[PDB]
Design an enzyme around this catalytic site. Structure first.
Site, PDB file in Angstrom:
ATOM      1  N   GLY A  75       0.833  -1.189   0.000  1.00 35.49           N
ATOM      2  CA  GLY A  75       0.000   0.000   0.000  1.00 35.49           C
ATOM      3  C   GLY A  75       0.878   1.254   0.000  1.00 35.49           C
ATOM      4  O   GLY A  75       0.760   2.095   0.889  1.00 35.49           O
ATOM      5  N   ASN A  95      -3.020  -0.894  -5.360  1.00 36.79           N
ATOM      6  CA  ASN A  95      -4.116  -1.268  -6.238  1.00 36.79           C
ATOM      7  C   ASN A  95      -4.563  -0.053  -7.052  1.00 36.79           C
ATOM      8  O   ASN A  95      -5.585  -0.123  -7.738  1.00 36.79           O
ATOM      9  CB  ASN A  95      -5.281  -1.856  -5.436  1.00 36.79           C
ATOM     10  CG  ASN A  95      -5.819  -0.888  -4.403  1.00 36.79           C
ATOM     11  OD1 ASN A  95      -5.223   0.165  -4.138  1.00 36.79           O
ATOM     12  ND2 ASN A  95      -6.953  -1.216  -3.796  1.00 36.79           N
ATOM     13  N   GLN A 128      -1.380   5.945  -8.566  1.00 40.95           N
ATOM     14  CA  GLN A 128      -0.245   5.877  -7.657  1.00 40.95           C
ATOM     15  C   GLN A 128       0.946   5.234  -8.363  1.00 40.95           C
ATOM     16  O   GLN A 128       2.057   5.748  -8.304  1.00 40.95           O
ATOM     17  CB  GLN A 128      -0.615   5.112  -6.387  1.00 40.95           C
ATOM     18  CG  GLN A 128      -1.622   5.861  -5.518  1.00 40.95           C
ATOM     19  CD  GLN A 128      -2.072   5.072  -4.305  1.00 40.95           C
ATOM     20  OE1 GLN A 128      -1.586   3.967  -4.029  1.00 40.95           O
ATOM     21  NE2 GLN A 128      -3.001   5.646  -3.553  1.00 40.95           N
ATOM     22  N   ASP A 143      -4.277  -5.805  -6.039  1.00 45.42           N
ATOM     23  CA  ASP A 143      -4.947  -5.920  -4.758  1.00 45.42           C
ATOM     24  C   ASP A 143      -4.160  -6.910  -3.905  1.00 45.42           C
ATOM     25  O   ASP A 143      -4.069  -8.099  -4.246  1.00 45.42           O
ATOM     26  CB  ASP A 143      -6.394  -6.341  -4.983  1.00 45.42           C
ATOM     27  CG  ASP A 143      -7.224  -6.523  -3.722  1.00 45.42           C
ATOM     28  OD1 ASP A 143      -6.632  -6.616  -2.625  1.00 45.42           O
ATOM     29  OD2 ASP A 143      -8.460  -6.566  -3.850  1.00 45.42           O
ATOM     30  N   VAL A 144      -3.595  -6.433  -2.786  1.00 43.62           N
ATOM     31  CA  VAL A 144      -2.701  -7.257  -1.985  1.00 43.62           C
ATOM     32  C   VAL A 144      -3.438  -8.510  -1.497  1.00 43.62           C
ATOM     33  O   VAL A 144      -2.812  -9.536  -1.255  1.00 43.62           O
ATOM     34  CB  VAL A 144      -2.032  -6.502  -0.816  1.00 43.62           C
ATOM     35  CG1 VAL A 144      -3.031  -6.170   0.293  1.00 43.62           C
ATOM     36  CG2 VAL A 144      -0.851  -7.266  -0.239  1.00 43.62           C
ATOM     37  N   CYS A 151      -9.633  16.248   7.724  1.00 43.55           N
ATOM     38  CA  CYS A 151      -8.546  16.872   8.458  1.00 43.55           C
ATOM     39  C   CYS A 151      -9.071  17.512   9.744  1.00 43.55           C
ATOM     40  O   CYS A 151      -8.479  17.346  10.807  1.00 43.55           O
ATOM     41  CB  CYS A 151      -7.828  17.921   7.617  1.00 43.55           C
ATOM     42  SG  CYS A 151      -6.952  17.192   6.214  1.00 43.55           S
TER      43      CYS A 151
HETATM   44  N1  SAH Z   1      -6.285  -4.142  -1.001  1.00 46.85           N
HETATM   45  C1  SAH Z   1      -5.311  -3.272  -1.264  1.00 46.85           C
HETATM   46  N2  SAH Z   1      -4.287  -3.675  -2.055  1.00 46.85           N
HETATM   47  C2  SAH Z   1      -3.296  -2.806  -2.307  1.00 46.85           C
HETATM   48  N3  SAH Z   1      -3.156  -1.552  -1.882  1.00 46.85           N
HETATM   49  C3  SAH Z   1      -4.191  -1.170  -1.124  1.00 46.85           C
HETATM   50  C4  SAH Z   1      -5.279  -1.950  -0.772  1.00 46.85           C
HETATM   51  N4  SAH Z   1      -6.150  -1.215   0.027  1.00 46.85           N
HETATM   52  C5  SAH Z   1      -5.589  -0.035   0.139  1.00 46.85           C
HETATM   53  N5  SAH Z   1      -4.404   0.067  -0.559  1.00 46.85           N
HETATM   54  C6  SAH Z   1      -3.469   1.186  -0.582  1.00 46.85           C
HETATM   55  O1  SAH Z   1      -3.022   1.387   0.743  1.00 46.85           O
HETATM   56  C7  SAH Z   1      -2.579   2.754   0.885  1.00 46.85           C
HETATM   57  C8  SAH Z   1      -3.221   3.359   2.116  1.00 46.85           C
HETATM   58  S1  SAH Z   1      -2.731   5.081   2.377  1.00 46.85           S
HETATM   59  C9  SAH Z   1      -1.019   4.953   2.910  1.00 46.85           C
HETATM   60  C10 SAH Z   1      -0.079   5.179   1.734  1.00 46.85           C
HETATM   61  C11 SAH Z   1       1.403   5.168   2.124  1.00 46.85           C
HETATM   62  N6  SAH Z   1       1.792   3.921   2.842  1.00 46.85           N
HETATM   63  C12 SAH Z   1       1.721   6.400   2.979  1.00 46.85           C
HETATM   64  O2  SAH Z   1       2.162   6.201   4.125  1.00 46.85           O
HETATM   65  O3  SAH Z   1       1.546   7.520   2.446  1.00 46.85           O
HETATM   66  C13 SAH Z   1      -2.893   3.428  -0.460  1.00 46.85           C
HETATM   67  O4  SAH Z   1      -1.781   3.247  -1.335  1.00 46.85           O
HETATM   68  C14 SAH Z   1      -4.010   2.543  -1.013  1.00 46.85           C
HETATM   69  O5  SAH Z   1      -4.052   2.630  -2.422  1.00 46.85           O
END
Ligand code: SAH
Ligand code: A1A4I
Ligand code: A1A4I
Ligand code: SAH
Lengths: 347, 347
Positions: free
Chosen positions: B126, B150, B154, B176-177, B322
């Site tokens: 993510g 996903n 990004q 999707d992880v 926020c």
């Molecule tokens: N099932 C899934 N598979 C892959 N990525 C996922 C996911 N569900 C959420 N995400 C990703 O998880 C992240 C959450 S936000 C955090 C983003 C980054 N780690 C930071 O610290 O800025 C985002 O990239 C979102 O696209």
């Protein structure tokens, strides 16, 4: 001033009110030591403690307490403790529950939470006078129940009781658990207020896991503080109490969560605590019963001890343990020190 | 009354003071819901929650938030967030620390606590806009760093940035992880504020463990409450806020300790929390920056959204996130909701 207090104590010159007040203050200082201003700091403190445990031997300092306390005569123990001579927090449903009833209720709670079922092999590590071993053996006739203890007096007491109760499914291993080697596995391993006598929980849990199969469950009950861990050791130079009750290195009080960090070889399934008023009621019942049977206790002890002075020493130790335990466990209506329970399976 | 509040909100008719007050009250109700009178009850509550997670799918409800939020235009995100577009709590050393500095300090803290070393393979699960991926890739030139997300937007942003920064050691998996299948293992797996989008942590941790060797470390950072867990969902019928910010089923707020109960396949090595004022300062900086660039933000959004009304909707959502986050994380000087971090190795 330490020698002074100890002097008055041994000579029965400290009234109960003053004694309770003094010990409460000592526990208050432990609370001030253990509570941090932020959760960030609280976790730093708790993690430092946990890490320190991983650099120690499995066993705590047990030699002295085994000889002096765990090898006391059963007949003296009968006059102070409940019917099955349980030496662990018991469970009091009602204002009027007796220690004998509270022992049985505690045994039932352990059978429930450890998911004991008829036909299982069961190992009780640090089985004491075997109240739980005997309970399980009588209630579950198809279970085989093994107690393990490093005390000859305990083993002998259990085997005699099993014979009197016409139980055929009980055996006892005489062993230091930290040295015990065996290929034997058990469906259920129970550790009731024994893990406090260990230090390196990593090594202890590792060994227990080798005595488990994929089908086994491990149930642990230990004295705890809800928030932080501490060794049961003098808080400062004014603390006459802590080192009187237990020798240095003998007893660790894990936090209610500390065992969650010892899952290299076992995995948690469930987690509970029992409020500290149950333990408070337990030590109070012991104290009152010792007081009631004071003359009898002294007569039982006099042979093996050799002097009225040495007898009074053992009695003062046990009574003060109960008086101090009352203040510890009743502190803030049982919401400081209490009993933690966890259920694990093998990796 | 819900439709009323939402009406005024969308039309910018709720002043900031009133908005902050309203959201604070909602968080207050969550606190009253989550704190139990005894540790016995607190553990019963927490354990019930943990058990419930084990009966769910690995993934939370992610589809809507991915499309609506995680697939927003990078150029809008640039006008609201810090330089690397970090979407996670940052770390503020000083009163005067800027969001850009706080992003970098946070990245450094993760590298320190995850024990990143040059030459390792690193997976960032993510990865968002890849601030951490890019940080590690630039600081450790012999590391290979993979981001996984996903979101197409990004991935595309990260690969463009890596090209501009002359980085050769970055790749991105679009997946999707919860569905990703691979035999590949990594020396380091990082999950920064992503696990909140999962539900069954048992299944999630299991999968991560298959991407680890005996030499690997797993580092997780998640929004938490220090004491209890909750889904980020309406507390009652008066709660207009929670379901406005996240769709039902999308986000879970684990307690600071909840992951300790998910050690079937990994084992904890270390555990920290970061006080919630850091997150509060993070959302405050985002809010102030969005406000500063309000006109610009609207212009960026107008194409892909199609109407000034729909643009104002996205902006209201982010700003309210926020404003509400400020009240949540600043509550009791950062000692309620905060950020938890844990380091694990494989079984
Ligand atoms: N099932 C899934 N598979 C892959 N990525 C996922 C996911 N569900 C959420 N995400 C990703 O998880 C992240 C959450 S936000 C955090 C983003 C980054 N780690 C930071 O610290 O800025 C985002 O990239 C979102 O696209
Ligand atoms: C004096 O007879 C005892 C009676 C009960 C117990 C113990 C006794 O001593 C042998 C010791 N255990 C087993 C070890 C752990 C422990 C630590 C304690 C405690 C009870 C405990 C338990 C419970 O009250 C403060 O701290
Ligand atoms: C609005 O842009 C965001 C900015 C920061 C965070 C998120 C954002 O949304 C996409 C969402 N994350 C990733 C998931 C978990 C989570 C849950 C939260 C939170 C921040 C989070 C974290 C951090 O404040 C209350 O509750
Ligand atoms: N290293 C060790 N090996 C075996 N038994 C030990 C031990 N250290 C302490 N013990 C035993 O652990 C017990 C602690 S007291 C608790 C006894 C019993 N479980 C009860 O609930 O009443 C005693 O039996 C003591 O003899």
């Amino acid at each position: 001033s330490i020698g002074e207090i100890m002097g008055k104590l041994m000579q029965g010159e400290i009234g109960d009110e003053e004694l309770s007040k003094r010990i409460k203050e000592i526990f208050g200082k432990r609370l001030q030591w253990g509570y941090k201003p932020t959760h960030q700091q609280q976790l730093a403190f708790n993690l430092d403690f946990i890490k320190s445990l991983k650099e120690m031997d499995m066993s705590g300092e047990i030699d002295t307490m085994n000889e002096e306390t765990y090898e006391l005569p059963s007949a003296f123990l009968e006059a102070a403790f409940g019917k099955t001579i349980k030496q662990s927090g018991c469970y009091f449903k009602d204002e009027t529950t007796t220690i004998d009833e509270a022992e049985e209720a505690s045994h039932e709670l352990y059978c429930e939470r450890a998911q004991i079922k008829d036909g299982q092999t069961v190992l009780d590590i640090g089985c004491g006078q075997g109240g739980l071993v005997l309970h399980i053996a009588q209630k579950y006739k198809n279970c085989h129940v093994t107690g393990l203890t490093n005390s000859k007096a305990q083993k002998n007491y259990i085997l005699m009781q099993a014979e009197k109760l016409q139980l055929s499914n009980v055996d006892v291993i005489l062993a230091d658990v930290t040295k015990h080697e065996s290929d034997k596995t058990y469906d259920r391993i129970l550790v009731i207020e024994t893990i406090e006598h260990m230090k390196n929980i990593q090594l202890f849990m590792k060994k227990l896991s080798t005595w488990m199969t994929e089908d086994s469950l491990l149930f642990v009950d230990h004295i705890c503080h809800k928030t932080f861990s501490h060794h049961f050791e003098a808080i400062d130079e004014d603390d006459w109490y802590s080192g009187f009750i237990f020798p240095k290195g003998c007893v660790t009080i894990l936090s209610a969560s500390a065992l969650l960090y010892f899952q290299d070889d076992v995995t948690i399934l469930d987690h509970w605590v029992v409020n500290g008023m149950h333990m408070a009621r337990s030590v109070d019942a012991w104290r009152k019963k010792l007081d009631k049977n004071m003359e009898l206790a002294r007569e039982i002890l006099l042979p093996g001890l050799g002097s009225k002075e040495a007898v009074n020493g053992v009695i003062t130790h046990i009574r003060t343990f109960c008086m101090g335990g009352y203040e510890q466990f009743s502190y803030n209506n049982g919401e400081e020190w209490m009993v933690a329970q966890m259920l694990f399976k093998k990796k």
